[PDB]
Amino acid sequence: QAPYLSPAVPFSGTIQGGLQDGLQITVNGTVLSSSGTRFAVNFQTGFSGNDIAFHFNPRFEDGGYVVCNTRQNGSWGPEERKTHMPFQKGMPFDLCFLVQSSDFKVMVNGILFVQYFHRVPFHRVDTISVNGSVQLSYISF
Numbered sequence: 001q002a003p004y005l006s007p008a009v010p011f012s013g014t015i016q017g018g019l020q021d022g023l024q025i026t027v028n029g030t031v032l033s034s035s036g037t038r039f040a041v042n043f044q045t046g047f048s049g050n051d052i053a054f055h056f057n058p059r060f061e062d063g064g065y066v067v068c069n070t071r072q073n074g075s076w077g078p079e080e081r082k083t084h085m086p087f088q089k090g091m092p093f094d095l096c097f098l099v100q101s102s103d104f105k106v107m108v109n110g111i112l113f114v115q116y117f118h119r120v121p122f123h124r125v126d127t128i129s130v131n132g133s134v135q136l137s138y139i140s141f
């Protein structure tokens with residue numbers, strides 16, 4: 001599938017034929033230096049945002065942490081927080097999401113940062129959305 005180039009934020013877009021084992025999604029952009037304190041990459045089913053299989057949510061708050069979570073039928077589940085901020089405000093980033101059968105792995109700037117085990121079946125998620133304090137250069141597959 002062709003990449004989305006300079007998509008405006010907030011973004012959503014379709015992942016052609018859905019998430020698959022071994023699919024790698026790159027999100028390349030810049031964290032804004034002073035336009036808020038959080039951003040999110042969401043892997044979801046459709047365009048509603050009520051069923052987000054994997055919400056990856058860096059927060060430049062309390063010194064900085066990343067929330068990983070799942071929204072199901074409009075309900076957020078138990079957060080998995082990573083008390084490690086691998087981003088810097090104002091700086092470019094390259095995020096890579098590797099879909100595996102049991103989990104997502106998230107590489108930040110080349111290096112595995114977090115592992116999130118599937119809470120809902122992944123082959124059904126077909127949409128990426130991005131919101132918050134970021135500018136995007138591209139999303140590639």
Ligand SMILES: CC(=O)N[C@@H]1[C@@H](O)[C@H](O[C@@H]2O[C@H](CO)[C@H](O)[C@H](O[C@@H]3O[C@H](CO)[C@@H](O[C@@H]4O[C@H](CO)[C@H](O)[C@H](O)[C@H]4O)[C@H](O)[C@H]3NC(C)=O)[C@H]2O)[C@@H](CO)O[C@H]1O
Pocket residue numbers: 010040042048049050055057067069076077079131132
């Ligand atoms: C200590 C503790 O338990 N803390 C809890 C808080 O962390 C918690 O905050 C919520 O946490 C969830 C993850 O658990 C999300 O980060 C929530 O933020 C919301 O995220 C959604 C999805 O990204 C976002 O909606 C999207 O917005 C875009 C455009 O911007 C568009 O409208 C899409 O349609 C939509 O999906 C939403 O805006 C965002 N809201 C905020 C305020 O960030 C986060 O609130 C709270 C509440 O559960 O509970 C604490 O106790």
